[PDB]
Amino acid sequence: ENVSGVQGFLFHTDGKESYGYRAFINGVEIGIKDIETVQGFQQIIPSINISKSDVEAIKKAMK
Amino acid sequence: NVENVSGVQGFLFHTDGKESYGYRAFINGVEIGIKDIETVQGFQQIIPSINISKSDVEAIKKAMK
Amino acid sequence: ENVSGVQGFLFHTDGKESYGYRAFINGVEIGIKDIETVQGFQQIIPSINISKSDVEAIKKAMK
Amino acid sequence: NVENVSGVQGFLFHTDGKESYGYRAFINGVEIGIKDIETVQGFQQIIPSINISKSDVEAIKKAMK
Amino acid sequence: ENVSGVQGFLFHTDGKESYGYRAFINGVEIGIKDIETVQGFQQIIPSINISKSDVEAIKKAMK
Amino acid sequence: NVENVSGVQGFLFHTDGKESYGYRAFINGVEIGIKDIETVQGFQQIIPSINISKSDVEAIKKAMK
Amino acid sequence: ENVSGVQGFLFHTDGKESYGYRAFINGVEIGIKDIETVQGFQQIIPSINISKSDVEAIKKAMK
Amino acid sequence: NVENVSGVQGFLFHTDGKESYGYRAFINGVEIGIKDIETVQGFQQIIPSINISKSDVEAIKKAMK
């Protein structure tokens, strides 16, 4: 079972124009300001790459 | 049969046949086109990636509705 | 958990009169036209044999 | 205790006693007769196959309703 | 997952007055007439001992 | 963390202290007394069997309601 | 699956003023009087430390 | 991916950066401050403990609502 009470993922792009790290947490999209928080959540949710051009489509599907 | 922590159910699909349609995906029941290979590799970390002929996409869309 | 979002199976017969490959996907019966698609779905759902004479009964139970 | 991907719950049943009734199955709560051994072998890939005496089938049907 | 679609158990007593084999199948109590059927269901559900004097209490809890 | 096929959730309980109350059980939220050791051994195949002091039974009943 | 029908945990403090052992059992807070019962439930639920000053906050979250 | 018997979902969080806020937790969707290290070590037996910058706590609260 998911003891952490969190479902979702971190996402970022390694392309030319970064949007920082963001996350979907329990169906809510948030921005992450600090790398400490990124590494903290990487202990409990996956962290994947999403290009800047694709974030809008993924946002729609995660609604 | 392991816990899904990502809150994402679905799969990537493409064809290796004639008439590529690029990469697409079903993400929580929503069909999307994928524009960049980076995003394909990212979602391949959390959902399966399978082959679907161009001729079969419409039928699969009707089941994934 | 079923990360793929698909529940069901492919079915076909090896008997004298083929009906091609079909599948039940999330309770919806579809025909599959291309072997590429069959092999794609064999990565994520089972593929079993069902004789032509038995498909009608299985259809009823999968309603 | 592993994930069931097939969307099928049930079992095949037959008797090895006197008075065979062939192979039958419960598929998602629906009782069916099976006409061909090919179908028996196919469903044996995804659901259990057990023995039930002819005299016990009616009782099992009432529980599998 | 429970692919068989059956939840329950077989029960019998080895005491002086047998009541045969019975079973709870999906919350329904039935008698089992033939040992072939007992061994068939032992492939998919547990088989435990319950004394004749205790069957009434277990019936109440399985209602 | 394995599949429960028995359709029974609960546990047997007894005390090894002063003032035995015999063996009892919670079976799907119903508290019962057990009359025969055979039944204790049978249910020990499918549900846990733990020790509860006589003085604590009332509190546990209120949680298992 | 949780065959025992119990979800929760035992809690106590090793600090200067003990409150005994308590437990949350299926969302119900109870006191435990006897160590036999503590060891019995330690067979089936976790047993953690909670300081006396923190029990009120944990009670609120377990409501 | 193992059974959670504790009836608790959530996590402990603290920062190692400038401006500590101590240890806090989400417990079944309720945010709490933790006053004693004993309680931190106790909950570390049953829920994860992760790092969250002070600047990110407000955003995480909005998702954990």
Tokens of G53: 């000053």
Determine contact, residues F11/G42, Cβ cutoff 8 Å. no
- Which residues neighbour A63 within 8 Å (Cβ) at sequence distance 6 or greater? none
Q: How many angstroms separate the CA atoms of H30 and D37, rounded?
A: 57
Contact C60 D30 (CB under 8 A): yes
Best D39, D45, D46, D47 residue to mutate vs chain C (most C CBs within 10 Å)? D39
- Whether there are 3 or more C-beta pairs closer than 8 Å between C and B is yes
Query: Contact H56/A37 with Cβ under 8 angstroms?
Result: yes
Q: Are C13 and C19 in contact (CB under 8 A)?
A: yes
H1-60 residues touching B, CB cutoff 8 A: 1
One-letter amino acid identity for F60?
A: I
- The structure was resolved experimentally with X-ray
Residue G23 region by backbone torsions, left for phi larger than 0, else alpha for psi between -120 and 50, else beta: beta
Return d(Cα F59, Cα G14) in angstroms, integer.
23
Alpha-carbon gap, residue D43 to B43, rounded angstroms: 33
Pair G29, G56: CB distance under 8 Å: no
CB neighbours of E32 closer than 8 A, spacing ≥ 6?
D56, D59, E10, E20, E21, E22, E23, E38, E41
Closest CA to C41 of B57, B21, D2: B57
- How far does B62 lie from chain A, in Å, by closest CA? 17
Check: CB of residue E40 under 8 Å from CB of residue D52.
yes
Minimal CA separation from C20 to chain D, in Å: 15
CA distances from E37 to D64, E10, E14, E18 (A): 15, 11, 18, 17
Alpha helices in A1-63 (DSSP H): 35-41, 55-61
Phi–psi pair at B10, nearest 5 degrees: 155, -160
- Cα of E15 to nearest chain D Cα, Å: 24
Q: Do residues G56 and G19 lie in contact, with contact meaning Cβ atoms separated by under 8 Å?
A: no
Using a CB-CB cut-off of 8 Å, the residues of chain H touching A34 are 17, 53, 55-56
Alpha-helical (H) ranges within C1-63 are: 35-41, 55-61
Q: Which amino acid is at G48?
A: I
